Symmetry: D2
Subunit: 301 residues, 4 copies
């Protein structure tokens, strides 16, 4: 039988608000914008609600502080200190298991891989149904910077970022393709140098700071919101789409069962598969260092 798709967004900050806006604008689902803070989620939901007619959308967008309102959610996006982040996840995990245990859960909470692992543990949801948003944001930046260099549509650039965050982030130069032309082929054609590739890789790692330093009083929120919506579409439309994200990886990249940044295939069953990229020896080590860092910090919590 037909029910409207339902996306619950936990946290009415800047990311959460724009997720609700975009979801509503696209008529992808109804939105429940959850936050404990009084007024904020109601105000944004009312504001967004007024725009629905402007976009020709019939999506319903409401604000709340009651987990009961996320009952039957198809997707839960969690945007809401290490210990403090864990406290928030624990609270949502209880809400999700009571009211929407079949939900696909997308975490946007640092340190990502560790926090995603924690939510899976405390919620007890299938590992394939819990993931984290980072790779799509990082990969989109990576693709954009490569696109800027060649003067081409970024959508026609293939480029994935795997691993964790900061220096744990691994932009896989070996994954890079423009219109089917590999990066190695461009070097030989004299259209790019290894120095310029290294700069793009470095630029991908520090892009967050480029935005943060310019915003002065906050971090990026337009692109992280778009990324989360793209992950939610993949699930809701059963796209079998390639989504770099923090996912439960076993028997790929030499790990046996751990949350890490990988190129997944997402569909109606959440993470349905993981792709194995060719990595250079230095990319192997950086990926190994990222895995160790997640595994070690998971010992603490």
């Amino acid at each position: 039988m037909i029910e409207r798709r339902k996306i619950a967004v936990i946290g009415s900050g800047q990311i959460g608000g724009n997720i609700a806006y975009i979801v509503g604008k696209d008529n992808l689902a109804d939105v429940v914008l959850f936050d404990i803070a009084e007024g904020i989620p109601q105000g944004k939901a009312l504001d967004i609600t007024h725009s629905m007619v402007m976009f020709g959308s019939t999506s319903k967008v409401i604000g709340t502080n009651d987990y009961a309102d996320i009952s039957g959610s198809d997707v839960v996006i969690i945007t809401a200190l290490l210990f403090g982040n864990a406290r928030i996840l624990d609270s949502v995990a209880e809400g999700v298991k009571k009211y929407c245990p079949n939900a696909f859960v997308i975490c946007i909470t640092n340190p990502l891989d560790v926090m995603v692992s924690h939510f899976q543990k405390v919620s007890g949801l299938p590992h394939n149904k819990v993931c984290g948003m980072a790779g799509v944001l990082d990969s989109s930046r990576f693709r954009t910077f490569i696109a800027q260099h060649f003067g081409v549509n970024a959508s026609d650039v293939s480029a994935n970022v795997i691993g964790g965050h900061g220096d744990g982030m691994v932009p896989a130069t070996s994954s890079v393709s423009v219109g089917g032309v590999p990066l190695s082929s461009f070097i030989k054609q004299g259209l790019i140098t290894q120095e310029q590739i290294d700069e793009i890789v470095c630029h991908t790692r520090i892009a967050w700071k480029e935005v943060a330093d310019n915003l002065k009083t906050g971090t990026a929120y337009f692109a992280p919101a778009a990324a989360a919506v793209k992950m939610a579409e993949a699930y809701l439309k059963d796209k079998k789409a390639v989504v770099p994200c923090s996912a439960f990886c076993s028997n790929h990249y030499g790990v046996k069962g751990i949350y890490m940044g990988v190129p997944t295939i997402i569909g109606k069953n959440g993470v349905e598969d993981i792709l194995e990229l060719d990595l250079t020896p230095l990319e192997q080590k950086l990926l190994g260092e990222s895995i160790n860092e997640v595994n070690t910090i998971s010992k603490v919590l």
Copy 2:
């Protein structure tokens, strides 16, 4: 000759940023986000740029503090006391006539009708190429509340708000219809009462405060940004769309050459016509009072 469409957004605040976001998302145009503040337009533009690939859009979005970057802009949307705002418009006006005098200018400044008029006078752009955003926002809220009562799709509700801001706003109840059924016909069918209509009319007038009181430290910005985009779309795509906005009214509603909230037809030549709604005597008084306040506040100029 093909050049990409170009929209200049003046003011990198909350409304401005979302305009750039949505324009970029839809691939409606390239975006120049202008502001004086150091870094803010640059940072939002970079962030929005990273999302372009996610949306499948090739729109370029840049931040700037230089009016030379708004040159060749097809549309300029201005989001940036009475004299303080007019001072900002003077500065923007000099940018526009220097770098993009053929642009379609949409103002989002309080008080709207006064400020739009002032920009037109100082810029000296044709009257049809300068307007203000309010009617689309107000009418959308109006349509939404009517929709919510009847339990129908708000896009299938026709409902227009004319006149001025806040209390000067006039939700024309005679413009209201749902699927071809007029509002008076629903009263006779017992599906709505006049008291419920009055509440909806009242709700429309204070909806801004319902939002603002909830947000606590700011005013509405998601819906205002979308409203501005729909106006830019109507111009850029030559839709001949019914857009309620602050427009120069020459021979309609008993006035002769003043900016006021009216249902316009917007196309490639800007405001191309104005529709005349049937107003009840009470709605006429309300419109009269709105027009009268615009004369008073505009006269204050020393």
Copy 3:
């Protein structure tokens, strides 16, 4: 639980193929294209499948001659002498109640009101989950011609066609409005005359022939396909949309339990309500005559 939405299109003709195309393009659903003819549904489905990547859609589109492939269909659109068409509907009805009895069924068969009723009776599906497509097509043409007169965006025109097919069609001139301005108000303003309204009403009734005479060897199919899609969208997305269609009218327009062209509200439970338009005495007579023909042709059943 997430499964992809699924639309079954019965009949791989010109209307059927374009429905599959557009549904796939929009990623509204997976598509099963059903027909008896050897190869035709398969070939169109393969061709349409190749375009999916071009549109960025992951919709699956397959051809079949087996009713087991329409199982779990959320929407069934039926495009495939009086007795000859009813014979096709009998066969489709048995497929539907066997493999997808919870489907929302949209019929596109002449004569519509009669054929829709027949499918409902033979299938025995709830009355609210069976309807026919005509009113959306007719109203769209109606809105378009009104739009063309006034030189405005046709989406900003409210105009509804009710009643039956061809001559039995009733363009309700009292439902007509442009940006909140009723049609009678335009007459008083000198922007339109009653003779021009009559031409537009007349044009709406024979528009099918204007197209058919031009195409020479067939009838309209681009617009009918789109009209069917909008109906499926209203159901699949629970829009509560104003959809003029052939629907079961129980306590509206002075009738008591008959299929007829009426402005419905369509949502996730199918036809969820019916709106009542103010009809002039002349429009009532025309509606009466349409309803009377439906009784006669339906009675012919031996």
Copy 4:
């Protein structure tokens, strides 16, 4: 100043009709549907016109037999026997040079590469402003078949077809990528064999017949129409998008100046660049044979 974009579609057959439909549906431009045949273009344009309100589009769509009506066209798409095809192109070429010499011209007329060269010659339009639709159709099929095998979103497959038609068509296996994973890497992972790759390549070449044999009374028209619209979008939105198509190639693929199937970059100046794919020795020879075939048939006309 703002003018509505204008696309002229020459030929009101099945491809031309669906181009007009899609263009209108997307509100990409106004459409002028030109055909000499009486009634057909008027009827389809009237029919399509009625649907515009259903799609919320204000695109104007008209039918005509007068070249005067294609005045100011931004794009011309030509869908309307070797000699007979040349006669049609000659006629359009005269219409375009008189009424819209700044138009970007997309040809869909076999044999493609030869016919595109001919239109450029007789019209005298800049070489970068005249091209042919084949590669996008062939590449889309190629991507789809690879996507079907791996069970992934075809949009996340990168795969280009270059060269000409039939056996002259060259699906570049070396261009193939899924989520950044090259085809060679999948073979090593045991997810595909060389035999299955060969079948996909063969399937791409004969796909036209798979559709034609099933339709019985015509050839493919839904996908070829979509392909032409995608090429027109690239131009009108100045996308700098990767578009495999019949384009004027000099100093790439060992040719000095000839129309052939290549991966182009399309923007507001038409074909603005051409990408060089790695080709295997057998792909080189097949490409060479395609070039020779076009060059030789151009000697005839």
